[PDB]
């Protein structure tokens, strides 16, 4: 089996991508945010705390045929922005893109915290980090590609996320028309649960490619690029009037200046992201200061590639017996 989805950036800014998820018996469709940095499919849900949903939409698990209530499961999941949300647990079907997996796990949120309550576009997280990640207890549950595995073409997942722009998730096969060149692959460790490999460096603007191992983990539920610091001042020393804000929580720059591109290395390759995706736009509306796309990891302990550095990228999620990863220039 395969299954294809598109899926749509929330905002002006590429903040999020949410994509259609088909959810029991009929089908209830919640746009979730498909985020390989996590390993649960929570949603907002009928028992959501009333005064936490604002526009969301919801499961009803008692409006679904197939749904079971995986008796005693409670989760709790709290995200590296700081964000969290809580709940209990169904089993029901689940599609995406025309993959279909029964007696999937559904987290329904009974809390969640103000930053998801404040998101309206947003009805819920899909994750598709390692199993090992999730928060279901007693039973740990296993994630929608891990459960949809053994039936695909390809124990596969690719990512082509757009900038300014809709994209797609596929599961079970690489669409050889979605991509330039090559796809150049390279080791992951699971160790932590994440999609974790190592960059072989990287350049700023037309700048000489600098030779220096990068571990961090490719994170599509994170919008920006998060790197050493000694990287991140090396980018921002380019662009005039750039400095680190404590005040804004990061680099600002004048929304005036052309930003340069930042080059990533996968192996021996080299992808590139354009200036205009490290824009993120006024820090507050009206100002003439912008909030740059290239953040420091100092403070997270651990280097995160993004959506800004995703997104210039066919990625493949290469969930074979020893995973890998994919990088292709689009």
Known sequence: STGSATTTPIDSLDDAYITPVQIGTPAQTLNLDFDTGSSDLWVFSSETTASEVDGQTIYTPSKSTTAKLLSGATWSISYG????????????????????????????????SSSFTEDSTIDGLLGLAFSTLNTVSPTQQKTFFDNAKASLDSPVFTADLGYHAPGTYNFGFIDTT???????????????????????????????????????????????????????????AQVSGAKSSSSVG??????????????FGVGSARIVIPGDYIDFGPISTGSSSCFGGIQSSAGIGINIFGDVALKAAFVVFNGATTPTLGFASK
């Not at 080791?187 to 700023?204: H, I, R």
């Not at 990061?250 to 080059?263: D, I, K, Q």
């Open 81 to 112: 922005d700081g964000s969290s949300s809580s709940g209990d647990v169904y089993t029901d079907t689940v599609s995406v893109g025309g993959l279909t997996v029964t007696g999937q796990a559904v987290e329904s949120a009974k809390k969640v």
């Open 250 to 263: 990061g680099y600002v720059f004048p929304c005036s200046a052309t930003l340069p591109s930042f080059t």
């Open 178 to 236: 979605a991509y330039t060149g090559s796809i150049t692959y390279t080791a992951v460790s699971t160790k932590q649960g994440f999609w974790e490999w190592t960059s072989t460096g990287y350049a700023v603007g037309s700048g000489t490619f600098k030779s220096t191992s990068i571990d961090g983990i490719a994170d599509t539920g994170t919008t920006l690029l998060y790197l050493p610091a000694t990287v991140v001042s090396a980018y921002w």
